Amino acid sequence: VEKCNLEDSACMTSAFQQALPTFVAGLPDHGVEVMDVLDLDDFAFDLSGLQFTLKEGKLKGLKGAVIDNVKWDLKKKNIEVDFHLDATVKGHYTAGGRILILPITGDGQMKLKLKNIHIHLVVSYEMEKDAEGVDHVIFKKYTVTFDVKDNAQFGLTNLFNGNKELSDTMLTFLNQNWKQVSEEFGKPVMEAAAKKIFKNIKHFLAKVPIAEIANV
Ligand SMILES: COC1=C(OC)C(=O)C(C/C=C(\C)CC/C=C(\C)CC/C=C(\C)CC/C=C(\C)CC/C=C(\C)CC/C=C(\C)CC/C=C(\C)CCC=C(C)C)=C(C)C1=O
Secondary structure, three states: OOOOEOOOHHHHHHHHHHHHHHHHOOEHHHOEOOEOOEEOOOEEEEEOOEEEEEEEEEEEOHHHOEEEEEEEEOOOOEEEEEEEEEEEEEEEEEEEEEEOOEEOOEEEEEEEEEEEEEEEEEEEEEEEEOOOOOEEEEEEEEEEEEEEEEEEEEEEOOEHHHOHHHHHHHHHHHHHOHHHHHHHHHHHHHHHHHHHHHHHHHHHHHHOOHHHHOEO
16 A cells, blocks of 8 residues: 555545555455445335335446545544445346336346446544554444436336336436436445445454554
8 A cells, every 4th residue: 555644635545546446356365355346235225115125236336436535634533535436236126116206116137327426435433552552543433425426327127017118118217317316215225335345444454554554
């Protein structure tokens, strides 16, 4: 890793950028799972009238993320990371209920393409000495917000029992109302990914002395 003074944001931004692809490829012997393609645990939500499930979920694109800024605040003991990427979410979905003003049913495969999604991550940490006297950054909590800035496209198979007219109408509807759909339903999907990524970064930093990857 590129070593930085922690409050040198330009350095930290580059250091996160240069490490990211290698980190998200996974470090299996160290217990760090692959994060591109990231396997999502099975999840479901019931929000705004939509009942949705995703199994075998996959998130592609983190390897290609662009780090916009890293601000490590030693006083507050928080780290703010702003980044963006194109991503895809795939998996076996089910849908029921309604999407906004249209009824929906489906059970099939999904390919959701997200263009220029911006993510704002805040993490709280503590610097802790382990039983052997070695200092580590220990991540505690996080928050994430998102904004899909360019567009999102929805590919869903076997909507409406295979009915092409209804399926075409729904896919058109989703793509037309992509921003609203992202604001209604993005949070649970983001969380399925973020909880896994956070656990992996936390684990990695708990086992790598802070002195090995940063300057005091
Ligand atoms: C010493 O300094 C340090 C380093 O060196 C400087 C390091 O390298 C490192 C490690 C290396 C880096 C820190 C790597 C860190 C990696 C980071 C921060 C990446 C973080 C990843 C995020 C937390 C999560 C990312 C999540 C995503 C991209 C998923 C986003 C998806 C979203 C928002 C979904 C949007 C949804 C929609 C549009 C619609 C959803 C619709 C539906 C679900 C329904 C579909 C429609 C119906 C009808 C079926 C550390 C830790 C360090 O401290």
